[PDB]
Amino acid sequence: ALTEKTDIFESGRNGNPNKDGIKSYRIPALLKTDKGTLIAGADERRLHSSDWGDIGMVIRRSEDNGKTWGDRVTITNLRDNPKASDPSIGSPVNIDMVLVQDPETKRIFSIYDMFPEGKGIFGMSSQKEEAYKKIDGKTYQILYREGEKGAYTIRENGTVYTPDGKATDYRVVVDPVKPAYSDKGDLYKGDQLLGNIYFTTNKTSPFRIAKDSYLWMSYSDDDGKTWSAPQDITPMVKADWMKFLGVGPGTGIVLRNGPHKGRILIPVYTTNNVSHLDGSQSSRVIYSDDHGKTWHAGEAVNDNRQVDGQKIHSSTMNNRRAQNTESTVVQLNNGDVKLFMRGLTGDLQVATSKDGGVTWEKDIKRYPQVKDVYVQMSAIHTMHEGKEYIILSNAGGPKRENGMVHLARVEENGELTWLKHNPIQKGEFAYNSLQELGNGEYGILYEHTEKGQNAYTLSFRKFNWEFLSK
Amino acid sequence: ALTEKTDIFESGRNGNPNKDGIKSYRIPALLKTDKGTLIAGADERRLHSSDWGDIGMVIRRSEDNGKTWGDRVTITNLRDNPKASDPSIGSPVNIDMVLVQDPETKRIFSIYDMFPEGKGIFGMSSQKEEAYKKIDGKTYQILYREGEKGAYTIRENGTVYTPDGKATDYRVVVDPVKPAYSDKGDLYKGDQLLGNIYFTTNKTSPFRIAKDSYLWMSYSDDDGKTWSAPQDITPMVKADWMKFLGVGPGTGIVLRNGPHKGRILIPVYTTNNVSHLDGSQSSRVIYSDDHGKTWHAGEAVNDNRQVDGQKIHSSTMNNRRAQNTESTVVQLNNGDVKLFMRGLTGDLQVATSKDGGVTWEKDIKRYPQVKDVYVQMSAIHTMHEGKEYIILSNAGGPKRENGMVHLARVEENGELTWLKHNPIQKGEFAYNSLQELGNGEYGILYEHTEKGQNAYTLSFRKFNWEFLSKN
Ligand SMILES: [Cl-]
Numbered sequence: 001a002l003t004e005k006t007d008i009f010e011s012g013r014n015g016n017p018n019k020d021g022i023k024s025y026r027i028p029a030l031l032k033t034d035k036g037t038l039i040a041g042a043d044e045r046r047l048h049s050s051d052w053g054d055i056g057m058v059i060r061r062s063e064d065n066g067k068t069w070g071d072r073v074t075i076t077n078l079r080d081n082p083k084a085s086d087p088s089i090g091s092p093v094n095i096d097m098v099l100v101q102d103p104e105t106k107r108i109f110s111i112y113d114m115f116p117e118g119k120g121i122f123g124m125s126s127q128k129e130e131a132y133k134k135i136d137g138k139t140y141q142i143l144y145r146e147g148e149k150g151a152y153t154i155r156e157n158g159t160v161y162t163p164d165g166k167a168t169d170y171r172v173v174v175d176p177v178k179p180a181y182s183d184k185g186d187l188y189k190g191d192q193l194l195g196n197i198y199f200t201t202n203k204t205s206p207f208r209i210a211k212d213s214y215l216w217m218s219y220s221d222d223d224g225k226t227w228s229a230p231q232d233i234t235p236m237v238k239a240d241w242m243k244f245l246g247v248g249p250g251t252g253i254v255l256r257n258g259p260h261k262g263r264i265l266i267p268v269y270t271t272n273n274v275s276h277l278d279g280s281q282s283s284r285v286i287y288s289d290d291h292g293k294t295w296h297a298g299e300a301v302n303d304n305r306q307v308d309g310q311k312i313h314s315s316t317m318n319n320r321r322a323q324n325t326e327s328t329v330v331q332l333n334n335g336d337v338k339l340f341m342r343g344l345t346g347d348l349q350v351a352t353s354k355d356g357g358v359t360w361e362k363d364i365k366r367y368p369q370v371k372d373v374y375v376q377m378s379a380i381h382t383m384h385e386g387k388e389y390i391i392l393s394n395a396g397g398p399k400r401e402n403g404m405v406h407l408a409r410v411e412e413n414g415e416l417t418w419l420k421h422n423p424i425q426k427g428e429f430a431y432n433s434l435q436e437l438g439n440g441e442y443g444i445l446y447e448h449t450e451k452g453q454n455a456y457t458l459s460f461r462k463f464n465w466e467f468l469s470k
Numbered sequence: 471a472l473t474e475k476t477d478i479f480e481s482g483r484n485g486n487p488n489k490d491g492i493k494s495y496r497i498p499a500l501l502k503t504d505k506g507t508l509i510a511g512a513d514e515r516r517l518h519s520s521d522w523g524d525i526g527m528v529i530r531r532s533e534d535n536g537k538t539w540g541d542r543v544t545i546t547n548l549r550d551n552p553k554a555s556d557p558s559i560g561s562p563v564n565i566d567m568v569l570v571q572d573p574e575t576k577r578i579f580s581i582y583d584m585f586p587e588g589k590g591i592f593g594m595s596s597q598k599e600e601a602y603k604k605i606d607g608k609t610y611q612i613l614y615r616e617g618e619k620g621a622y623t624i625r626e627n628g629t630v631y632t633p634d635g636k637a638t639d640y641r642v643v644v645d646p647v648k649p650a651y652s653d654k655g656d657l658y659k660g661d662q663l664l665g666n667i668y669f670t671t672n673k674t675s676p677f678r679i680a681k682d683s684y685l686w687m688s689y690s691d692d693d694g695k696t697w698s699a700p701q702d703i704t705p706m707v708k709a710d711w712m713k714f715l716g717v718g719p720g721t722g723i724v725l726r727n728g729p730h731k732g733r734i735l736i737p738v739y740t741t742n743n744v745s746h747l748d749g750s751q752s753s754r755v756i757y758s759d760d761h762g763k764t765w766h767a768g769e770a771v772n773d774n775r776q777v778d779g780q781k782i783h784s785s786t787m788n789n790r791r792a793q794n795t796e797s798t799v800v801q802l803n804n805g806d807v808k809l810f811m812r813g814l815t816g817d818l819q820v821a822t823s824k825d826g827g828v829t830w831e832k833d834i835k836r837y838p839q840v841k842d843v844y845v846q847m848s849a850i851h852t853m854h855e856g857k858e859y860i861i862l863s864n865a866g867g868p869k870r871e872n873g874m875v876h877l878a879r880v881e882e883n884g885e886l887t888w889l890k891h892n893p894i895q896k897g898e899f900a901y902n903s904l905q906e907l908g909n910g911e912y913g914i915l916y917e918h919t920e921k922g923q924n925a926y927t928l929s930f931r932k933f934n935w936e937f938l939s940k941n
């Protein structure tokens with residue numbers, strides 16, 4: 001009914017690095033592929049457990065349904081700034097991935113956040129720094145040059161142009177070739193390596209990008225074995241008013257029925273400049289209708305939402321308790337999309353979209369049957385048999401402890417009735433990612449610590465329907 | 471050397487309406503056309519002097535260099551909400567115009583603010599209400615229906631579409647036909663008038679637009695005698711983060727030299743949602759390179775501006791003293807654009823663009839020679855014999871009093887050397903608009919009160935180089 005845990009990504013112990021020199025792993029994502037492979041994704045947090053520092057986006061693959069696992073594959077690992085005073089905040093940062101496979105092209109996507117060097121999200125500029133300029137139709141990333149106000153641009157082949165549109169002999173590595181693409185952003189003047197556009201302190205080159213918040217995507221066409229260079233999808237989805245835009249980590253979906261069948265959905269959330277992380281964190285999805293080539297932002301659950309007898313909008317809100325942050329997305333058989341959102345009510349909050357994740361119904365449903373201690377969760381659609389269910393996993397509480405697997409029935413109505421609640425991991429429990437394995441089996445990859453382990457070790461268990469019904 | 475004043479728009483006295491039932495006139499704009507005609511524009515503020523209520527955008531024409539003036543022509547006058555409880559805030563509002571003529575096509579433009587019914591800018595929603603939606607390449611105005619969350623849209627022919635994209639039996643008057651276009655926004659079902667999409671209280675129809683801030687444009691091809699229906703240019707220029715976006719009233723310009731020759735420049739200013747009117751008012755220009763067909767926003771003077779050793783951006787700033795609001799724009803012979811900005815320093819603030827108004831130099835120049843009491847100003851380029859000058863008019867102070875005309879030599883590098891400072895109106899003096907008349911003689915339309923006149927009566931005077939040069 002329930003396997004012992006197998007550690008997939010092992011953290012160090014007692015504040016020290018593990019044998020691989022890594023203190024921490026965080027942020028599990030779990031994906032069952034068309035070939036039957038399991039892909040387990042994580043942040044490899046080398047220096048410490050926080051959402052900054054030197055972090056690699058990594059996966060391991062299992063070809064035997066989770067029994068054994070191959071070598072870590074590093075998707076992306078931006079190089080640290082060797083001149084940074086504080087190495088703990090001294091590297092351009094990637095954190096938080098969402099995995100999903102396109103069932104038609106078989107292409108697998110990892111979408112994750114990026115910040116230039118600094119304390120991650122806390123390293124964003126206090127005043128807006130424009131990150132992109134649209135020139136004669138084409139969108140280019142901006143560079144700021146030491147002691148100058150104007151917006152330089154990174155154009156084709158990575159040639160840097162002056163604010164007034166003249167090509168310089170500066171070049172940015174826009175087609176990285178090094179393992180894990182560690183050369184991305186390197187800045188050259190002709191033949192000479194000068195620095196990196198993602199460095200923001202003690203710079204040895206003239207140029208840096210905006211101190212803002214970015215969304216990157218890498219893809220695999222060989223079942224997770226190798227990965228493309230990162231693709232900067234930010235300007236496709238990030239509105240000018242948005243401060244932070246980041247993923248709700250875990251595993252995204254592809255709509256399997258209705259008019260929008262084939263659409264890829266990725267949970268994300270934003271903040272605004274009015275109240276940032278204090279009162280504006282707002283869930284939504286981004287989506288692709290062309291197999292991951294182009295991306296669009298849906299509306300926020302909080303857009304024109306009625307809260308306490310007054311309307312709010314994700315761009316202007318300042319309401320701590322009306323926030324909804326990281327989320328997990330499921331499509332029902334009736335075509336409706338459900339968004340389960342981390343928040344501050346103490347119980348489960350759920351939004352419904354009838355147009356394939358573009359807009360949301362006027363009310364958020366709350367379920368007091370499922371506690372929410374303000375931590376990430378994952379949920380998946382499952383059939384059994386053939387009655388419709390959703391499995392949702394998160395911390396039971398009262399703190400981030402006692403991992404639970406919750407079973408809901410989806411009524412002919414679209415409503416959910418919570419039937420079963422079963423512990424899956426005693427002790428520390430935080431982020432997690434569920435997947436159907438087939439033949440009545442399910443897998444979960446989750447954050448837990450024991451025996452002095454640093455936050456966190458990511459471990460894998462399998463369970464079956466008999467476990468669910470307990 | 472200086473004519474006596476001719477009142478062009480006369481306010482009421484002692485808080486009462488004038489003979490035409492109008493309490494107030496405000497916001498002068500003066501335009502010398504290609505034909506020599508003088509167009510004088512204003513807000514005709516019927517009920518009171520404030521930036522809301524029942525206001526018409528009006529002009530008068532002078533064909534003899536300001537001696538006689540014709541009848542008032544009303545460009546736009548949205549109808550009031552007949553069911554509003556408080557008539558003082560009971561009408562959709564237009565305020566604040568900028569005039570300009572395209573020297574090539576001879577088209578004359580009037581660009582002005584619009585708000586739905588309410589207390590003008592103070593009637594904007596406290597949270598963002600989306601005003602436009604893009605669907606299959608086309609941008610549509612949104613309508614909101616009582617008790618429903620979703621965005622209805624006004625599509626082709628004014629037909630209202632449901633949020634899920636189906637045609638309804640409702641239609642909006644998108645091509646208004648009544649005098650001063652007072653039927654604009656009327657909401658019909660079949661042939662029955664139900665109400666108006668600009669009404670926000672005590673509505674008789676199901677739909678209203680976003681409670682936001684809009685920019686409208688009307689044009690004339692017959693020297694100001696008649697005007698087009700208003701064109702909503704907002705979606706071309708208003709970024710998602712912007713709260714207010716409104717004109718810096720007066721007279722805009724067309725660049726006459728350099729790589730951007732022919733560009734129409736219209737001063738505007740924005741606020742953001744972080745500090746709105748308290749800490750974010752920020753000047754910029756909108757512009758057209760295709761004779762007014764399409765419009766674009768330049769960057770703010772405040773965008774990536776260093777202020778006390780720290781950067782600000784117009785979209786995020788909260789700095790009262792760093793604001794710049796209504797402004798007046800001039801192009802120099804060297805091609806630089808100068809933006810003279812209303813602000814809170816006590817003296818003249820000037821920004822410079824080297825790229826035809828799109829981006830601004832890192833420094834704002836302050837000129838101690840010219841006082842600024844926190845009020846609108848105007849400035850024009852002028853050639854004399856033929857050396858290059860700017861004339862700038864505003865209140866000399868200490869309050870909104872003593873209208874001055876300021877003369878600057880423009881130096882080869884674009885610096886301004888202030889030469890002369892002459893009073894042009896004792897007592898009350900506020901908004902104003904200068905033009906070159908020819909000789910050189912010069913005209914000015916300005917706000918002033920005397921004899922108990924309500925804020926304001928707008929008057930016209932001429933002056934010559936001899937009054938300008940006065941020691
Ligand atoms: Cl560098």
Ligand SMILES: [Cl-]
Pocket residue numbers: 664665666667669672673674675676677
């Ligand atoms: Cl109505």
